[PDB]
Amino acid sequence: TNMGLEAIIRKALMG
Amino acid sequence: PYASLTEIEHLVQSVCKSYRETCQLRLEDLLRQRSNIFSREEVTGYQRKSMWEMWERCAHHLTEAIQYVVEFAKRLSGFMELCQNDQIVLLKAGAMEVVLVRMCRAYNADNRTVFFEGKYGGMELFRALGCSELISSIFDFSHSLSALHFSEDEIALYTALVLINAHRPGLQEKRKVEQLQYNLELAFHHHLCKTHRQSILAKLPPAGKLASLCSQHVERLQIFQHLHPIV
Ligand SMILES: COc1ccc(-c2c(-c3nc(CC(=O)NCC4CCOCC4)cs3)cnn2C(C)(C)C)cc1
């Protein structure tokens, strides 16, 4: 899993 | 309490819907799955795995769950209205704490076991992680939480309050978040009063530091993946 911490939340929030 | 009684009852229901919709597995299914427990051969299978391999699997599961927590946040009445800086700040500080609450929620006190990858298993299942001090404290937190018997609605409101906390450093719209938090405290307070369980939050242990550590391990693996085997 390359994306983690704040980077995964940012990606997750875009929706 | 200026808010009318009917308006608060809806806020309870809206928050519970968001929690139930966004759990990875429905609680009712979790209780029904308590019968199937990993076989001693399956357990040893997990123990044979290399520290990295078991951490790599566990960290992916923490990140998957985080993603479902972000969805929970989106469903909160006022979360979308907040500026993206604030939306991100609240999720950085709190989203891992919710995760631990949701995973520790899928636990069985009778035989001290946790739902993990399809079947229930005990603390011994995690020996490959090699942080027994962390694993025993996490299982303790889960056992204490089980004693309190939180309902889905009580667990939905409490996790909601963890995310929507107005004291996190770096919030731009502090006042806007306090208003959203207060409304959740009003709601939750009413629900505890109706059921005579005002004292339950005092008895819950703090999971903040445990989650801080879990986040540190998740980050550790992403910083160092080039030194470990490829996906
Ligand atoms: C016993 O307490 C523990 C808590 C967490 C853990 C735990 C996990 C879990 N990964 C899953 C993956 C999974 O089965 N997902 C489906 C569930 C998710 C929760 O909601 C119900 C469906 C469940 S646990 C990953 N890392 N850790 C640490 C030990 C590092 C912390 C272990 C043990």
Side-chain angles (χ1 to χ4, degrees):
Chain A
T1 66
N2 304 2
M3 299 200 179
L5 206 27
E6 79 176 348
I8 176 55
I9 305 169
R10 298 158 180 285
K11 186 81 170 178
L13 269 169
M14 270 296 316
Chain B
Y2 166 48
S4 62
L5 172 53
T6 172
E7 193 211 335
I8 64 188
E9 285 164 358
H10 289 74
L11 187 51
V12 173
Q13 303 342 306
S14 161
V15 167
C16 306
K17 191 81 187 169
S18 302
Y19 179 87
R20 293 215 67 162
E21 287 181 345
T22 60
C23 293
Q24 270 141 292
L25 260 69
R26 302 172 292 166
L27 182 66
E28 292 176 51
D29 289 25
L30 288 176
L31 308 182
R32 275 161 37 98
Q33 295 289 344
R34 282 190 182 192
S35 41
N36 77 83
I37 286 80
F38 281 115
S39 76
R40 188 135 194 187
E41 198 199 349
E42 279 162 327
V43 167
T44 303
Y46 286 102
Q47 295 173 340
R48 298 208 213 187
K49 289 177 187 305
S50 68
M51 182 174 172
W52 167 80
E53 198 180 324
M54 194 62 190
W55 265 119
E56 177 66 357
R57 306 177 63 107
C58 293
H60 190 314
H61 286 295
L62 290 175
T63 56
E64 174 188 20
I66 281 277
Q67 301 167 355
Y68 280 82
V69 177
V70 179
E71 298 296 345
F72 179 55
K74 297 183 186 180
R75 324 220 175 187
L76 295 173
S77 165
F79 195 70
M80 300 308 221
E81 288 138 54
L82 298 168
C83 67
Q84 297 214 6
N85 168 68
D86 290 11
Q87 298 184 11
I88 293 165
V89 164
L90 293 176
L91 291 163
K92 281 180 78 151
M96 188 64 64
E97 186 164 329
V98 169
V99 168
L100 282 190
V101 168
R102 275 192 172 183
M103 281 171 176
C104 295
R105 191 96 186 84
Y107 172 85
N108 176 5
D110 297 0
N111 61 20
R112 292 209 195 76
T113 72
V114 63
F115 184 93
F116 181 76
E117 306 186 351
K119 301 186 185 165
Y120 283 69
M123 196 178 316
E124 60 176 9
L125 188 137
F126 303 92
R127 183 166 210 92
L129 301 179
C131 308
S132 73
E133 65 294 342
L134 179 54
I135 314 308
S136 311
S137 45
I138 285 164
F139 269 79
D140 298 345
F141 165 88
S142 318
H143 201 67
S144 317
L145 176 65
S146 195
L148 304 179
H149 297 89
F150 278 75
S151 76
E152 277 305 74
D153 295 21
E154 301 183 335
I155 222 70
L157 298 154
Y158 172 68
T159 54
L161 279 180
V162 171
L163 296 175
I164 306 301
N165 167 351
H167 299 289
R168 317 295 203 177
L171 286 183
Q172 282 192 236
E173 302 174 29
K174 161 145 186 175
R175 292 296 187 207
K176 178 53 203 162
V177 175
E178 287 179 8
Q179 180 63 10
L180 291 184
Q181 159 159 33
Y182 180 67
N183 289 8
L184 290 171
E185 295 192 356
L186 272 184
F188 198 17
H189 189 202
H190 169 81
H191 181 102
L192 297 177
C193 285
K194 85 200 295 188
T195 62
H196 306 277
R197 315 199 78 201
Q198 291 82 309
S199 56
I200 66 180
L201 301 187
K203 307 180 194 204
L204 182 64
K209 161 268 182 159
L210 300 170
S212 171
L213 295 193
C214 292
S215 296
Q216 288 154 36
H217 291 92
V218 169
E219 178 180 12
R220 189 173 55 76
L221 271 93
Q222 74 101 352
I223 292 169
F224 306 112
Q225 49 185 356
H226 318 286
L227 299 178
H228 296 290
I230 196 172
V231 189

